[PDB]
């Protein structure tokens, strides 16, 4: 199936409290593999997945050096943005950056991303043609011109279409056992009477990987989108995910409802009915 690799960077200023907090994490699909925490003792890029631990010191020394360069860039960015929007040097602010690439089921380049946000709001992003930019406001346009003059977009497409896809593949290979696995969800339902005339029917999807999944409830085969309590897909903590969906059913009508499950790990969609 499809795959992706992306780096997430969060920078938070700490006025009068010293250096800005900086955190970086890398993911291949839904598995995190590296991290860097400006407040940590090592001051180095660190492994968060078993399959990346085999990389030698050359890899860790290199990534530690580049991630520190990122840290410094965002430390300069915080001050610049503070200036662009004429803000008090006393308040705390946040800058986030995300970039990466997607490859199809054929492991071939599908698309590249490079987005930036200031205080949780879109600031600037690289368009899909990897040649132009989307500037949120006037401050962003100033950054856009700067990046255009420095031919930043060009350097980004080379990384996104080359290096990014190349290393993603390498990671997928080195981590075949983890990254290339598909754990079809384990499913089951629970029934709990809220009153003498209504009951809760909950549909569970457990231990599945990857995270992408579709879980719905239907009544007489019709969608119940608005009468369904659907929770956000969540991490189990062991690399797998979970999710459930529930509907309040009039006692005696359990048979009219069906749970539907779709996942890459299931050759054919599942349909469950309490009976």
């Amino acid at each position: 199936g499809s795959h992706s690799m992306r780096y997430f960077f969060t920078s938070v200023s700490r006025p009068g409290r010293g250096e800005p907090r900086f955190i970086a994490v890398g993911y291949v699909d839904d598995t995190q593999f590296v991290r860097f925490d400006s407040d940590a003792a090592s001051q180095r890029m660190e492994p968060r997945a078993p399959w990346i631990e085999q990389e030698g010191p050359e890899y860790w020394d290199g990534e530690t050096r580049k991630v520190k360069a990122h840290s410094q860039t965002h430390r300069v960015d915080l001050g610049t943005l503070r200036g662009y929007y004429n803000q008090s040097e006393a308040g705390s602010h946040t800058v986030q950056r995300m970039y990466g690439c997607d490859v199809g089921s054929d492991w071939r380049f599908l698309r590249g991303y490079h987005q930036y946000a200031y205080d949780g709001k879109d600031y600037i992003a690289l368009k899909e043609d990897l040649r132009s930019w989307t500037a949120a406001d006037m401050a962003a346009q100033t950054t856009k011109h700067k990046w255009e003059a420095a031919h930043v977009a060009e350097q980004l497409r080379a990384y996104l279409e080359g290096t990014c896809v190349e290393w993603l593949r390498r990671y997928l290979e080195n981590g075949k056992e983890t990254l290339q696995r598909t754990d079809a969800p384990k499913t089951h339902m629970t029934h709990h009477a809220v009153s003498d005339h209504e009951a809760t029917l909950r549909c569970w999807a457990l231990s599945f990987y990857p995270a992408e999944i579709t879980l719905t409830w239907q009544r007489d085969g019709e969608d119940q989108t608005q009468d369904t309590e659907l929770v956000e897909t969540r991490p189990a903590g062991d690399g797998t995910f979970q999710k459930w969906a529930a509907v309040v059913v009039p006692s005696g009508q359990e048979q009219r409802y069906t749970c539907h499950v779709q996942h890459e790990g299931l050759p054919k969609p599942l349909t469950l009915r309490w009976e």
Partner: peptide
Amino acid sequence: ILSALVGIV
């Protein structure tokens, strides 16, 4: 791996 260059805003 991370990208090489990182220009400021």
